[PDB]
Amino acid sequence: NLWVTVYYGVPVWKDAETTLFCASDAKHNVWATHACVPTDPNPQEIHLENVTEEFNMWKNNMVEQMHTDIISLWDQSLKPCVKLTPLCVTLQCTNVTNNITDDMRGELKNCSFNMTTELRDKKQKVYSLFYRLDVVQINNKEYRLINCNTSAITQACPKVSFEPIPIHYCAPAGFAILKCKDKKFNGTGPCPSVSTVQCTHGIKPVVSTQLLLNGSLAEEEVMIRSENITNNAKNILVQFNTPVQINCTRPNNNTRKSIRIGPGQAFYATGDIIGDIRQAHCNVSKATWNETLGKVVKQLRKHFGNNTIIRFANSSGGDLEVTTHSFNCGGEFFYCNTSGLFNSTWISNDSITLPCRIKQIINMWQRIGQAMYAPPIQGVIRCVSNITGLILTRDGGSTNSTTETFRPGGGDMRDNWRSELYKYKVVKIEPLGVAPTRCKRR
């Protein structure tokens, strides 16, 4: 004598996709955190006892949503800023002298041109300084901006800062965010220690290549993650146990000048560099890097054998963004050469100096048709950061190869934010059940 009894509010969930919203701690920023909900001081995390879940790092939709949101915010931030259409003219450029060094020879050019005024009746002869990577010669000499045959340039608004700030992703009503608490989780498979939350930890959208900066550290050991470790077409994500400090600087004392190109529209050009001219560069610690590489190769020798020679070489081909460590240091975009970091072989006080280059016409998100111009920054620039990860790729050495070669990679930013959203998943609650009892309706 058993009867069907209905229960509403049972702990059952399913896998689902939804739109998560943004929250930030409680003004001109690229990612408009002022429009996001303020965050609670003490978030609730509920450990689910005796619960085992299945996670997949490489088929997560939070990564896609985060990529789309970042791209959309970047596009939105450039709407009210000045268009630089009259800047696509012919420039007359000369080489820069007066206290340049040997390594800085030919990197700066002094270009004069004619520019429109606030009156639609006359011109003005002005001049500026351009980096060699921003101008292409058309046959002193005649140059043009690198972009004036493919796209249009918008000048970045100088009051908006590029500094990343932490953001949190929250689930709507009827959804939960499951979080894996295993300390040696390798991205895919069963996690037996699970908690539930509604918000993720503060994630800073740092854009960089070949090196992960200002991120999270593994709790126990260096972690190696890959979708298919035997497939050499997949990238390898390496997570450090301790960070590696890196100091980058542009030492030139720059000057900024404002040129009126129309009614209520100004253009910020580079003036003169007071003093000498030197090359921007980064410093890393040699001993710390050696120890980190030793730990990385120690962890790598668990998938490829115990007696295999493991050697690190540098990048192989590509454009400037993918063959260099590209990042942003206080409004200036750096492209640094990492041939001194990934160059060694391993058999079973000092510093490393990486020279860098500066560019001012920026194409982001591997797109074409839209370009941004970064106005110059005044004074000497210095930044300090943590290296907390690596992106690597393996060469497909066939014909009985006893050695493996790993090269730095990158280019796709989904793997930058896949190294932070790797322990979260989104579930949808289904609070309706039926079961046999001995109670009958009266």
Binding site: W3, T19, P431, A435
Partner: protein, 112 residues
Amino acid sequence: GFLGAAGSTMGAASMTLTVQARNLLSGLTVWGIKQLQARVLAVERYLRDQQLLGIWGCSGKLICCTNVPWNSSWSNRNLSEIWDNMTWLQWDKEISNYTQIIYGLLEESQNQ
């Protein structure tokens, strides 16, 4: 708190239904529209569940007994190994095949 008894037996999770019940309703223009749609969808799901409960005769209840007898072909386990040695996540995976038949029986039993 929320989803606390997901690893506990079916019996232990029957005393905390209100925790999950109350965490289903409140717990540029492009982003403004996206957030609004989620809030409308949660309300729609809640209203559909409430309408189904009302149609079954169980409006305003968390636990509700019915006049529909339990067919032994849906499950053969006895009450000792269901309410004391089983979780809801396992029970759903087992009775997922017979859910629609039971729902139709509930509807037609309440109507008649």
